[PDB]
Design a binder for these strands. Structure first.
Length: 30
DNA sequence: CTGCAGGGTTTTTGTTCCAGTCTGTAGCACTGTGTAAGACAGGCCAGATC
């Protein structure tokens, strides 16, 4: 049914790839 | 109910390469601190003996 995931500031900067996609796109379009 | 097997899942974590851009290091030929006396030999003039 998915997966529990701990908070972001403990993950590597890389770990991120998944989270900002939509914001990178929205700022670009903007 | 349990146990673990072995699949589903999302989500780490990293993967290959080509433009570059920054950053730290090795490459450069090359530098600083050792620093003052005496000992031994030979000559020979002085100077005292006598």
């Amino acid at each position: 049914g998915g997966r529990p995931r701990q908070h972001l500031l403990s993950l590597t900067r890389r770990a991120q790839k998944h989270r900002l996609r939509d914001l990178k796109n929205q700022v670009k379009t903007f």
